């Protein structure tokens, strides 16, 4: 309803961590709407205009030597410091997946179905989910949602298997995740339900 | 690649005079500062036991951002943001079973500017009881995303929609969900 034009300024101060805290990169990034116009990169050591809109700021800010020294110390004073503060509840966080299996539509044997393995509530994102028919891994006919962020520090994923189920078959979904020491596995039997 | 990223994201939006300050770890929110209450709000209550943040510093950062926005608006010959309308998806927090408490999640993605109107509807009527939401989360393409939550008891009788308004949409976008 409200059609007044909008104007947006964003600033993203980023810390990127490689190999624990052994390598850190700090990026101080300024945006006008969606477009980055100036940044400080710890791998460069000074501000650089990203668009011509940023040229005046880069020139102005690089002429202030105590500003620069402070940005140059951000890898330590800011990045490493904040990693330390949050590490116990972020880097160190692990939450178990919950696994459920169910057919997608209810229908007779010898007719095409999707078996769903739903994996829920886990943290961090890295997971692997495998389908077996009896004891052979099925890698054709696997339709997956990929990793879904729930926005509350958990993820889910749904990994579906295309089947034409026959009477005496067992299918198993197998989940591995850094919170688990041995695979979590759930079975589904080709019965009249 | 890189193990982890922490981002402190701020914005200021005119003429709405609305600002945000938040910290992000691998794409989840750690906390934000409420500009109304002027208070640090932890995404999970647990986080508050391990850490603190002086919400006043966020307020001061946003004043600089406001002042910069005035300058950049002028420097661009008053060129405004181009609306990018959201993608909306609705899913459940866990597999759906009758009478088992669950949560519908409205995931609103790839949009700007960071202003939306989001209503949960149950059978075509607005619902507020037990609902929650996040602030605007930053994306690497500099758009935003946002999540809304609705606790519910699944039934055969009910249908739900996530209703989303945004200036880049011609009409409000509804995304539907019902028990399979």
């Amino acid at each position: 309803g409200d059609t007044r034009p909008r104007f947006l300024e964003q600033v993203k101060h980023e810390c990127h961590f490689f190999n624990g805290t052994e390598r850190v990169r700090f990026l101080d990034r300024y945006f006008y709407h969606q477009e980055e116009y100036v940044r400080f990169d710890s791998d460069v050591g000074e501000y650089r205009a990203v668009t011509e809109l940023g040229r005046p700021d880069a020139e102005y800010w690089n002429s202030q030597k105590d500003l620069l020294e402070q940005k140059r110390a951000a890898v330590d004073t800011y990045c490493r410091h904040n990693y330390g503060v949050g590490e116990s509840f972020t880097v160190q966080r692990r939450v178990y997946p919950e696994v459920t299996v169910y057919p997608a539509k209810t229908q007779p044997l010898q007719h095409h179905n999707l078996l769903v393995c739903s994996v829920n509530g886990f943290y961090p994102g890295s997971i692997e989910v495998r389908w077996f028919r009896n004891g052979q891994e099925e890698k054709t006919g696997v339709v997956s949602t990929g990793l879904i962020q729930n926005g509350d520090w958990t993820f889910q994923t749904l990994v579906m298997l295309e089947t034409v189920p026959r009477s005496g078959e067992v299918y198993t979904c197998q989940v591995e995740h850094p919170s688990l020491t041995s695979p979590l596995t759930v079975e589904w039997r080709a019965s009249s339900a | 690649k890189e193990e982890h990223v922490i981002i402190q994201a701020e914005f200021y939006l005119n003429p709405d005079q609305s600002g945000e300050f938040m910290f992000d770890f691998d794409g989840d929110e750690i906390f934000h500062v409420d500009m109304a209450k002027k208070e640090t709000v932890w995404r999970l209550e647990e986080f508050g036991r391990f850490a603190s943040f002086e919400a006043q510093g966020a307020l001061a950062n946003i004043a600089v951002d406001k002042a910069n926005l005035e300058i950049m608006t002028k420097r661009s010959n008053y060129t405004p943001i181009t609306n990018v309308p959201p993608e909306v998806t609705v899913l459940t927090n866990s597999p759906v079973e009758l009478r088992e408490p669950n949560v519908l999640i409205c995931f609103i993605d790839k949009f700007t500017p960071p202003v939306v109107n989001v209503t949960w509807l149950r059978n075509g009527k607005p619902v507020t009881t037990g609902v929650s939401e996040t602030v605007f989360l930053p994306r690497e393409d500099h758009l935003f995303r946002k999540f809304h939550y609705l606790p519910f008891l699944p039934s055969t009788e009910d249908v739900y929609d996530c209703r989303v308004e945004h200036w880049g949409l011609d009409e409000p976008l509804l995304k539907h969900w019902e028990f399979d």
Partner: peptide
């Protein structure tokens, strides 16, 4: 045991 997140501060534009 309980630590304090530090904010980065934005610079003022030319």
């Amino acid at each position: 045991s309980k630590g304090l997140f530090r904010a980065a501060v934005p610079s003022g534009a030319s």
